[PDB]
Ligand binder design. Structure first.
Ligand SMILES: OC[C@H]1O[C@@H](O[C@H]2[C@H](O)[C@@H](O)[C@H](O)O[C@@H]2CO)[C@H](O)[C@@H](O)[C@H]1O
Ligand SMILES: OC[C@H]1O[C@@H](O[C@H]2[C@H](O)[C@@H](O)[C@H](O)O[C@@H]2CO)[C@H](O)[C@@H](O)[C@H]1O
Length: 289
């Protein structure tokens, strides 16, 4: 989505910019580009290239070229052995002079998918294998504020985020990831933003094989409850954890099977507006419904 999903982000590169992509463009990979088009813009381009050689000019797997004229458009093409391929023009350009934009390039198995300002713009079939793309170039009249990446790898820690919709009965938070091969423990916290206290602290401890959960209220930890019919976590084990909010307590499940219930100690459910995750895991995805 916004920032907890990026593993790498660069601000204000000078144009022309030619930089190495920090990881492979694997399917599901997201490249987010934010900037604005100057008032005198005639054209600019985002090129995903194999290398950065200028002689011979490095192959351009995917040339994204917004052009500004009476019938604004985006010209896409591929360059092989210094020669251009079949030109693909998308008209009704989303881009406009003196306006800012957000470009989201999603890497797919067989093509690139591109959305601008949250609206689908075009698809581009792979002409060069994306494994071969290792550098991103930006040229022309365009100002880039930031570029960011979200590889299919894991997310970076710590993970801190506000939850779009307030916490309340029926509200769900699902977390997916993998416990590190040599994990000790990790935690998943639901906090009251301002208060800065913790409504629900889920802390699985692998070294002690126990699931500690507690509440942090009034600048202090409460009475811990570890009772459980079966430790759901194992070092190196993939998992999905669903935290369901009910009227009387939280219901927590792991890999499709219920683990435990935690009666509410922080009664103002609607005030629980922050999710925090940390510890010995590879966080793969966080979803609050
Ligand atoms: O095809 C991408 C490539 O287009 C070049 O311009 C084209 C132009 O669109 C067309 O009208 C003309 O007949 O041929 C030119 C060369 O193929 C751009 O110069 C180049 O930078 C890419 O944008
Ligand atoms: O209540 C959860 C809270 O536990 C803290 O650790 C405790 C530990 O559980 C207890 O056995 C020991 O005697 O004292 C420790 C004091 O911290 C964690 O440090 C904290 O992060 C929470 O997980």
């Amino acid at each position: 989505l916004s920032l907890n999903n990026l593993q790498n982000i660069i601000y204000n590169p000078v144009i022309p910019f030619v930089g190495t992509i920090p990881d492979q463009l694997d399917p599901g990979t997201l490249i987010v580009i934010r900037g604005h088009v100057p008032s005198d813009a005639d054209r600019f381009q985002v090129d995903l290239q194999n290398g950065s050689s200028m002689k011979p000019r490095a192959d351009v797997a995917f040339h994204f070229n917004p052009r500004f004229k009476r019938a604004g458009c985006i010209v896409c093409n591929t360059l092989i052995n210094e020669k251009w391929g079949r030109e693909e023009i998308t008209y009704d350009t989303p881009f406009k002079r003196e306006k800012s934009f957000e470009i989201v390039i999603m890497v797919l198995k067989d093509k690139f998918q591109v959305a601008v300002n949250g609206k689908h713009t075009l698809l581009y079939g792979h002409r060069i294998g994306p494994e071969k793309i290792d550098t991103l170039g930006i040229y022309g009249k365009v100002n880039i504020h930031s570029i960011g990446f979200s590889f299919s790898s894991h997310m970076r820690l710590p993970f801190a985020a506000r939850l779009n919709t307030p916490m309340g009965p029926g509200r769900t938070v699902v977390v997916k990831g993998e416990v590190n091969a040599n994990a000790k423990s990790f935690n998943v916290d639901l906090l009251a933003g301002k208060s800065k206290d913790i409504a629900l602290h889920l802390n699985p401890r692998l070294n002690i094989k126990a699931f500690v959960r507690n509440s942090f209220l009034q600048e202090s930890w409460g009475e811990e409850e570890r009772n459980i019919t079966s430790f759901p976590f194992s070092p190196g084990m993939y998992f999905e954890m669903i935290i369901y909010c009910d009227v009387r307590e939280f219901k927590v499940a792991v890999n499709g099977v219920h683990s435990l219930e935690y009666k509410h100690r922080f009664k103002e459910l609607s005030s629980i507006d922050t999710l925090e995750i940390n510890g010995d895991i590879h966080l793969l995805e966080v979803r609050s419904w």
